[PDB]
Design a protein around this ligand. Structure first.
Ligand SMILES: [Zn+2]
Length: 446
RNA sequence: GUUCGAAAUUAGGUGCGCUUCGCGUUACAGUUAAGGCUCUAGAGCCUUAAUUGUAAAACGCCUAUACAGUGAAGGGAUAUACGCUUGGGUUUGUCCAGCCUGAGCCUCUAUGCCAAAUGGCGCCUUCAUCGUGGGUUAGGACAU
DNA sequence: CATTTGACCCGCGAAGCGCACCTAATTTCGAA
DNA sequence: CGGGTCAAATG
């Protein structure tokens, strides 16, 4: 093998071929997770609002009444409850709800049910039993316990090696799980400081995670010492990296980033391969995919042929203020940059915007300016519900460009067989695709 | 006695999943503040910006045998499910991740909250009732 | 009038829970 | 952070 991997690169120094691994999948999953969290928060907000509306209408506070107005507006921003006394606390929102429903002449049971709606848990929190480490011995596929549920077994695993009799071992085990008793025992039955910490840690600490062995095998681990450490749960991004490297190996070991070492070591054997744990070889993405974003995350405004969007003054770049629609605020922003000298950093800053007089919002917060969107065109605009989005995956091929079947019903501009990366006699696609900085129209299939 | 292997423990980092709280975006509607034009100091319209409210945030796919509210009763560690067995939806060229989830079950895993036993509560179940919902999707491989 | 050709575009923050998989170190037991 | 966008410019 000779594989050696590190940082963003790897080398199969059997051969001396270097390979570049994907160093993005982690950040892509991170934002595929932030998006899912945003979506689920919004769905729970809709659930809660539906329930609150139904209840308020059921008790005579119909939508036209001020009680409904106030309570429904309060239910949009209910505050946080992870702690107790950028957001208000659940208690302040519920205090305002009580105030409004009292002023509405509501009964105690009604206010209490509205409070229950404001405190309801719409999606269960399930985290106590999610990741399931199975027992290491080959004949025991059963679940290992959480280490906090078998503190007795873990304490026994340590006390079974003390120079004392079994009766004193059992007494000590029962005492530590009787506080000064264990201290006196150790003070008399001199024991190593590390062993004493370990037993105290098992007795007292918050034991996250599971044990390598089940109940029936925690103590028997010495009988299985020759079996190496096993792995079952590796990060999908590291899995993608390592499996791309392994696929390269399959098409075509002192393996010196260290995470996931055992997963490679086990895939390299797939039975007994030994392991000895830009010039890297000398030391030794497809955004059109079916799971990529169909469009941008921030919707755009598309009015009478002009694409614009609101960007904060601290989000509009120096040298680009010409996209700001307002003539007056363009001049104001230019008057701000010939004092700020922001051309280097180009980002501008909250303090600078406030000093320049762009703090116009409710909380003295920096205003926003509508700016025209460069780098986009009409062909990329889609409309879903009220939102207009830029889609970078509008092109799936060219026959005249071919529109994305997942967006044909949403394109604002009506439409008038080389796919991307095909071999022809393609890095960017269109009616005259870019083929490799040369662009041509008369490509032919090859 | 060195080395190596395992387990345990601790700290760091990396990452994965769940549940929320916001800001920002967008659509409409109402206001305020200006800028302009147009009718005639006002009045009508367009712009920008602020402030209010409500609504959308991937497309889709799958579910009404579904889903949630309310009430009653029963069960609640001889119990349930995030567990086990075995699925199904997302799901498509195909296969997956991840999430969700049905039926049976308690051999492994887990089991919360408010008040020493015990007591409520969440929880599970059946029914009655008003109904209109719920899950997943912004990732990876392969083929094309 | 098809090509270069050069600049431009792209959602952020926090909290509460779980978890694994690698480093660093120690104990203990097994071996080779 | 590729896949485009526009307008410009041997054209
Ligand atoms: Zn076992």
């Amino acid at each position: 093998l000779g594989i050696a991997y590190g940082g963003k690169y790897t080398g199969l120094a059997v051969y001396a071929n270097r390979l570049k691994m994907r160093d993005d999948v982690a950040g892509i999953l991170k934002d595929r997770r932030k998006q899912r969290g945003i979506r689920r928060t919004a769905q729970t907000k809709k659930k809660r609002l539906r329930e609150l509306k139904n209840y308020l209408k059921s008790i005579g506070y119909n939508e036209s009444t001020a009680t409904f107005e106030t309570v429904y507006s309060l239910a949009h921003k209910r505050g946080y409850d992870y702690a107790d006394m950028n957001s208000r606390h659940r208690k302040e929102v519920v205090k305002d709800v009580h105030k409004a429903m009292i002023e509405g002449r509501a009964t105690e049971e009604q206010i209490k049910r509205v409070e229950r709606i404001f405190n309801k848990q719409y999606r269960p929190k399930r985290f106590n039993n999610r990741i399931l480490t199975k027992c290491k011995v080959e004949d025991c596929g059963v679940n290992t316990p959480l280490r906090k549920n078998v503190r007795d077994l873990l304490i026994e695993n340590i006390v079974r090696f003390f120079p004392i009799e079994q009766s004193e071992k059992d007494n000590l085990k029962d005492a530590v799980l009787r506080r000064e008793e264990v201290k006196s025992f150790f003070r008399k039955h001199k024991t190593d400081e590390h062993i004493r910490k370990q037993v105290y840690d098992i007795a007292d600490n918050k034991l996250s995670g599971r044990t390598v062995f089940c109940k029936e095998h925690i103590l028997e681990h010495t009988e299985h010492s020759k079996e190496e450490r096993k792995v079952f749960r590796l990060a999908p991004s590291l899995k993608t990296k390592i499996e791309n490297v392994l696929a390269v190996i399959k098409d075509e070991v002192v393996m010196e980033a260290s995470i996931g070492w055992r997963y490679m070591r086990d895939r390299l054997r797939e039975k007994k391969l030994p392991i000895e744990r830009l010039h890297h070889a000398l030391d030794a993405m497809d955004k059109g995919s079916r799971g990529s974003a169909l469009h941008d995350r921030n919707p755009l405004s598309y009015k009478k042929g002009i694409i614009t969007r609101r960007f904060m003054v601290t989000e509009i770049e120096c040298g680009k203020e010409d996209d700001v629609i307002s003539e007056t605020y363009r001049e104001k922003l230019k008057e701000a940059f010939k004092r700020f000298d922001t051309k280097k950093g180009k980002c501008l800053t909250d303090k600078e915007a406030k000093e320049a007089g762009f703090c116009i919002k409710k909380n003295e917060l920096v205003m926003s300016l509508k700016c025209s969107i460069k780098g986009t065109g009409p062909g990329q605009m889609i409309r879903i519900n009220n939102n207009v989005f830029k889609t970078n995956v509008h092109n799936v091929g060219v026959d005249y460009e071919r529109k994305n079947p997942r967006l044909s019903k949403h394109f604002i501009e009506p439409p008038p067989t080389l796919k991307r990366r095909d071999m022809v006699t393609i890095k960017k696609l269109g009616t005259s695709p870019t083929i490799e900085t040369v662009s041509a129209t008369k490509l032919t299939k090859a």
